[PDB]
């Protein structure tokens, strides 16, 4: 059973790697907007948590 | 005097409300996609470690 | 090199200047990276050098000097 | 139908140009005079037909402009 579960573990590992790469790529792009919205446009007017 | 100021306020208000509606929506869309993929990655990370 | 690949990752994951990121520059107070920003920073550090880090030992890292110390 | 003001001009614009205050105001505006709140007759007339006068003077390649403080004036274009 532990061997059988380790195969599930490895599937999860590959999935996790893919998701990791995608998340990092998103952050890299979003950084530019953050540097650009330092004009005090983000604090409440743009970031409407509602 | 009223007839002047009333008009000016109408124009200010309409522009501000529509512009914020137009921009904030997509800004939050992006933030939410990034949040979602990060959350999925963290759940996968924790489950893999355990 | 590792000691400058760390800067490559930190600057482009927090958006701060290369000059700002010194060895002792802490992420939260100097670089301003908050909870999720630091999470993404550690994920990027993992990806760059294709390694993995424990949860507690990773969260212990809260500075450029500490970042390199665990990296190198 | 034919021989009808609407064929050639909007009714409100013709109504404005037919007013007794128009010649004085046109002569002054072309001369560069600014119009404030104090001269009620002229200012109220400008407010009543603002869009018609702006569209009319546009034929000359000049903008009839309204500052936020409420005073009108003419700004010519390059052409």
From TrEMBL, chain B:
Domain of life, source organism: Bacteria
Chain sites annotated for binding (R)-4'-phosphopantetheine: 42, 46
Localisation: Cytoplasm, Nucleoid
Record note on quaternary structure: Homodimerization via its hinge domain. Binds to DNA via its C-terminal region. Interacts, and probably forms a ternary complex, with MukE and MukF via its C-terminal region. The complex formation is stimulated by calcium or magnesium. Interacts with tubulin-related protein FtsZ.
Domain text: The hinge domain, which separates the large intramolecular coiled coil regions, allows the homodimerization, forming a V-shaped homodimer.
Similarity remark: Belongs to the SMC family. MukB subfamily.
Biological role stated in the UniProt entry: Plays a central role in chromosome condensation, segregation and cell cycle progression. Functions as a homodimer, which is essential for chromosome partition. Involved in negative DNA supercoiling in vivo, and by this means organize and compact chromosomes. May achieve or facilitate chromosome segregation by condensation DNA from both sides of a centrally located replisome during cell division.
Full protein name: Chromosome partition protein MukB
Organism field: Photorhabdus thracensis
Shown residues in whole-protein numbering: 248 to 297 of 1482
TrEMBL record, chain D:
Name under which the protein is recorded: Chromosome partition protein MukE
Assembly and oligomerization: Interacts, and probably forms a ternary complex, with MukF and MukB. The complex formation is stimulated by calcium or magnesium.
Annotated compartments: Cytoplasm, Nucleoid
Role description: Involved in chromosome condensation, segregation and cell cycle progression. May participate in facilitating chromosome segregation by condensation DNA from both sides of a centrally located replisome during cell division. Probably acts via its interaction with MukB and MukF.
Coiled coil segments of this chain: none
Lineage of source species: Bacteria, Pseudomonadati, Pseudomonadota, Gammaproteobacteria, Enterobacterales
Protein family according to the UniProt entry: Belongs to the MukE family.
Superkingdom of this protein's organism: Bacteria
Species of provenance: Photorhabdus thracensis
Gene name, Swiss-Prot/TrEMBL: mukE
């Amino acid at each position: 059973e532990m061997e059988n579960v380790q195969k599930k573990l490895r599937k999860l590992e590959r999935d996790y790697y893919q998701i990791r790469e995608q998340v990092v790529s998103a952050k890299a792009g979003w950084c530019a907007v953050m540097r650009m919205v330092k004009d005090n446009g983000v604090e409440r007017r743009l970031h409407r948590r509602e | 005097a009223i007839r002047v100021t009333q008009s000016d306020r109408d124009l200010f208000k309409h522009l501000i409300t529509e512009a914020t509606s137009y921009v904030s929506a997509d800004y939050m869309r992006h933030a939410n996609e990034r949040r979602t993929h990060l959350d999925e990655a963290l759940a996968l990370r924790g489950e893999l470690f355990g | 090199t590792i000691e400058e690949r760390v800067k490559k990752i930190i600057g482009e994951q927090l958006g701060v200047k290369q000059e700002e990121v010194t060895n002792n520059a802490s992420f939260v107070e100097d670089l301003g990276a908050d909870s999720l920003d630091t999470v993404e920073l550690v994920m990027a550090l993992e990806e760059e050098f294709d390694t993995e880090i424990p949860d507690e030992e990773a969260e212990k890292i809260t500075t450029v000097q500490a970042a390199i110390d665990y990296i190198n | 139908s034919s021989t009808h003001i609407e064929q050639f001009m909007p009714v409100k614009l013709a109504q404005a140009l037919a007013n007794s205050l128009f010649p004085e105001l046109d002569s002054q505006l072309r001369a560069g005079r600014h119009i404030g709140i104090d001269d009620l007759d002229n200012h109220a007339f400008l407010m009543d037909f603002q869009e018609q006068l702006e569209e009319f003077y546009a034929r000359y390649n000049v903008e009839l402009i309204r500052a936020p403080e409420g005073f009108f004036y003419l700004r010519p274009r390059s052409t």
